Coordinates of C-alpha atoms (C1' of nucleotides) and ligand atoms in Angstrom, one line a residue:
Chain Z
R103 CA -45.3 -2.7 -12.4
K104 CA -42.2 -0.9 -13.6
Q105 CA -38.9 -1.7 -15.3
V106 CA -35.2 -1.5 -14.2
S107 CA -33.0 -4.3 -15.8
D108 CA -29.9 -2.6 -14.1
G109 CA -29.4 -2.8 -10.4
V110 CA -27.1 -3.0 -7.4
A111 CA -27.0 -5.4 -4.5
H112 CA -26.1 -3.7 -1.2
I113 CA -25.4 -6.4 1.4
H114 CA -24.9 -5.3 5.0
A115 CA -23.1 -8.1 6.8
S116 CA -22.6 -7.5 10.5
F117 CA -21.6 -10.2 13.0
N118 CA -25.1 -10.7 14.4
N119 CA -27.0 -10.4 11.1
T120 CA -26.8 -9.7 7.4
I121 CA -29.3 -7.4 5.6
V122 CA -29.7 -7.6 1.9
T123 CA -31.0 -4.7 -0.1
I124 CA -31.6 -4.5 -3.9
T125 CA -31.6 -1.1 -5.5
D126 CA -31.2 0.9 -8.7
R127 CA -28.2 3.0 -9.7
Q128 CA -29.8 6.0 -8.0
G129 CA -29.8 4.3 -4.7
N130 CA -33.6 3.9 -4.5
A131 CA -34.6 0.7 -2.7
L132 CA -36.3 -1.8 -5.0
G133 CA -36.5 -4.8 -2.6
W134 CA -35.1 -6.1 0.7
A135 CA -34.8 -9.2 2.9
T136 CA -32.9 -10.0 6.1
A137 CA -31.6 -13.2 7.6
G138 CA -33.1 -12.5 11.0
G139 CA -36.5 -12.2 9.4
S140 CA -36.3 -15.3 7.2
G141 CA -36.9 -17.7 10.0
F142 CA -33.5 -17.6 11.7
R143 CA -32.7 -16.4 15.2
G144 CA -29.7 -16.1 17.5
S145 CA -27.2 -18.8 16.8
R146 CA -28.6 -19.7 13.4
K147 CA -29.3 -16.1 12.4
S148 CA -25.6 -15.4 12.2
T149 CA -24.8 -18.0 9.6
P150 CA -23.8 -17.9 6.0
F151 CA -26.8 -20.1 5.2
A152 CA -29.2 -17.7 6.7
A153 CA -27.6 -14.9 4.6
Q154 CA -28.1 -17.2 1.6
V155 CA -31.9 -17.5 1.9
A156 CA -32.0 -13.8 2.6
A157 CA -30.4 -13.3 -0.8
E158 CA -32.9 -15.8 -2.3
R159 CA -35.9 -14.3 -0.7
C160 CA -34.8 -10.8 -1.8
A161 CA -34.5 -11.9 -5.5
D162 CA -38.2 -12.9 -5.3
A163 CA -39.4 -9.5 -4.0
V164 CA -37.6 -7.6 -6.8
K165 CA -38.0 -9.5 -10.1
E166 CA -41.3 -7.6 -10.4
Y167 CA -39.1 -5.1 -12.1
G168 CA -37.2 -7.7 -14.0
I169 CA -33.6 -6.8 -13.1
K170 CA -31.1 -8.6 -15.3
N171 CA -27.7 -7.1 -14.4
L172 CA -26.3 -5.9 -11.1
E173 CA -23.3 -4.8 -9.0
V174 CA -22.6 -6.0 -5.5
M175 CA -21.6 -3.8 -2.5
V176 CA -20.2 -5.8 0.4
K177 CA -20.3 -4.0 3.7
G178 CA -19.1 -5.5 7.1
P179 CA -17.2 -8.5 8.4
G180 CA -19.8 -11.2 9.2
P181 CA -20.8 -14.3 7.4
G182 CA -23.0 -13.7 4.3
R183 CA -20.3 -11.4 3.0
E184 CA -19.7 -14.0 0.4
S185 CA -22.4 -16.7 0.6
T186 CA -25.1 -14.0 0.0
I187 CA -23.4 -13.0 -3.3
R188 CA -23.4 -16.6 -4.4
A189 CA -27.1 -17.1 -3.9
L190 CA -27.8 -14.0 -6.0
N191 CA -25.7 -15.3 -8.9
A192 CA -27.6 -18.7 -8.8
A193 CA -31.0 -17.1 -8.6
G194 CA -30.5 -15.9 -12.2
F195 CA -28.3 -12.8 -11.9
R196 CA -25.4 -11.5 -14.0
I197 CA -22.8 -10.0 -11.7
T198 CA -21.1 -7.0 -13.2
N199 CA -18.9 -5.7 -10.4
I200 CA -18.0 -6.6 -6.8
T201 CA -16.9 -3.9 -4.4
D202 CA -16.1 -3.9 -0.7
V203 CA -17.4 -0.6 0.9
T204 CA -16.8 -1.5 4.5
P205 CA -16.3 1.8 6.3
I206 CA -12.8 2.6 7.7
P207 CA -12.5 5.7 9.9
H208 CA -9.1 7.5 9.7
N209 CA -9.1 6.9 13.5
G210 CA -12.0 9.2 14.6
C211 CA -14.5 7.9 17.2
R212 CA -13.4 5.9 20.3
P213 CA -15.0 2.5 20.1
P214 CA -16.7 0.7 23.0
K215 CA -14.5 -1.1 25.6
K216 CA -13.3 -4.7 25.2
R217 CA -15.7 -7.3 26.5
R218 CA -14.4 -9.2 29.4
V219 CA -16.2 -12.5 28.9
Chain M
rC264 C1' 49.4 33.9 45.5
rA265 C1' 51.2 35.4 40.6
rA266 C1' 51.8 34.7 35.5
rG267 C1' 50.5 31.1 31.8
rC268 C1' 49.2 26.8 28.6
rU269 C1' 45.0 24.3 25.2
rU270 C1' 43.7 19.0 25.4
rG271 C1' 38.3 19.9 29.3
rA272 C1' 34.2 23.7 28.7
rG273 C1' 32.3 27.5 25.9
rU274 C1' 31.6 31.2 21.4
rC275 C1' 31.6 31.9 16.0
rU276 C1' 30.4 30.1 10.4
rC277 C1' 27.7 26.8 7.0
rG278 C1' 24.5 22.6 6.7
rU279 C1' 21.4 17.9 8.4
rA280 C1' 17.5 14.9 10.6
rG281 C1' 13.5 14.9 13.9
rA282 C1' 5.5 13.2 16.6
rG283 C1' 10.9 18.6 20.7
rG284 C1' 7.7 23.0 22.6
rG285 C1' 3.7 27.3 21.9
rG286 C1' 0.1 29.9 18.6
rG287 C1' -3.0 30.3 14.3
rG288 C1' -5.2 28.1 9.9
rU289 C1' -7.0 24.0 7.2
rA290 C1' -8.3 18.6 5.3
rG291 C1' -10.6 14.1 4.5
rA292 C1' -12.7 9.2 6.5
rA293 C1' -16.2 7.6 10.3
rU294 C1' -19.8 7.9 14.3
rU295 C1' -24.3 10.5 16.2
rC296 C1' -27.9 14.0 15.0
rC297 C1' -31.2 17.2 11.7
rA298 C1' -34.0 17.5 6.6
rG299 C1' -35.7 14.8 2.5
rG300 C1' -36.1 10.5 -1.9
rU301 C1' -36.7 4.9 -2.5
rG302 C1' -38.5 1.0 0.3
rU303 C1' -41.3 -2.3 4.2
rA304 C1' -41.4 -5.2 8.6
rG305 C1' -38.2 -5.7 11.1
rC306 C1' -33.7 -3.7 13.4
rG307 C1' -30.5 -4.2 17.6
rG308 C1' -28.2 -7.4 21.1
rU309 C1' -26.4 -12.2 23.4
rG310 C1' -23.6 -18.0 24.8
rA311 C1' -29.0 -17.9 24.9
rA312 C1' -32.1 -13.8 25.9
rA313 C1' -34.6 -9.6 27.5
rU314 C1' -34.7 -4.4 28.3
rG315 C1' -34.3 -1.1 24.0
rC316 C1' -35.7 0.9 18.8
rG317 C1' -39.5 0.5 14.3
rU318 C1' -45.9 1.1 10.5
rA319 C1' -45.7 8.9 14.2
rG320 C1' -42.2 3.9 8.7
rA321 C1' -37.2 2.1 11.8
rG322 C1' -33.0 -0.8 10.2
rA323 C1' -31.2 -1.0 4.9
rU324 C1' -30.1 2.4 0.6
rC325 C1' -29.2 7.4 -1.9
rU326 C1' -29.0 12.9 -1.1
rG327 C1' -28.1 17.6 1.4
rG328 C1' -26.7 19.9 6.2
rA329 C1' -25.1 20.6 11.6
rG330 C1' -21.7 19.4 15.3
rG331 C1' -17.8 17.4 18.3
rA332 C1' -13.6 14.4 18.9
rA333 C1' -9.5 11.8 16.9
rU334 C1' -6.1 11.8 12.9
rA335 C1' -6.2 5.0 8.9
rC336 C1' -2.5 4.0 5.1
rC337 C1' 2.8 6.2 5.8
rG338 C1' 4.5 3.4 10.7
rG339 C1' 9.2 0.6 11.5
rU340 C1' 13.0 -3.1 18.7
rG341 C1' 11.6 4.3 13.5
rG342 C1' 12.5 9.5 15.4
rC343 C1' 12.5 13.9 19.2
rG344 C1' 12.7 15.5 24.3
Ligands
MG658 MG1 -20.3 13.3 8.1

RNA sequence: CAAGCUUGAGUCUCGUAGAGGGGGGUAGAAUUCCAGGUGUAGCGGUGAAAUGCGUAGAGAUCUGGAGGAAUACCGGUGGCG
C-alpha cells in the first residue's frame, strides 16, 4: 500500500520473551511479531528458536512496503538477541548496521530483591 | 623545693594526597508517570501457572514533558576518618 525500502529492526529480548518490531528511520512501527504469540508458551517461549520464527513472521507482515535494507537494534539479555537477527538476514534482508541499545542506568533505581528459590 | 637541659610534646613557614565533615548549586543514564505519532493482539510472570495488564489500543517503537531517588565507566586486598 506504501513504500519504505529502508528500515530498522528493533528486537526486545527479555529473559521470558522476545518481541520483534520493524520500523522506518522515523521510529514509526511498520510491523511486529512476538515469540509468545507465535505458538510458543512458557518453557518454549523463551528459546532462540521461538525468537527466530518471530523474526520470520514479522518479515511477512512488513514486506507489504517492500523494505530492502535495515539496521538492527538489540535490546536485552535473553535468547533471540542473536538468532532473531539471523532469521531476518535469511528472510531476504540486507543488514546495514548492528547496534546494542540495552539500557544501563548510571546506578539510579533500586532493583527488586534477589529471589530465594 | 629551686634553677635548668632538648631528645618527648607543642608552635611557626612552604607544599602534597584524600568518597574526612557541613552548606549551596548543577549534570547525564534509567525506572515510573503524563501528552501525542506509528502500529495491532498480545504483554507480563513462572519450574509450570494463575492473579494482573491490553482493542477505553496495551506491550513494542519514536517524540515532548513532570517527578523522585541513586550516582555506571573511573574503581583497585585504592583512599579518608
Ligand atoms: Mg527520563
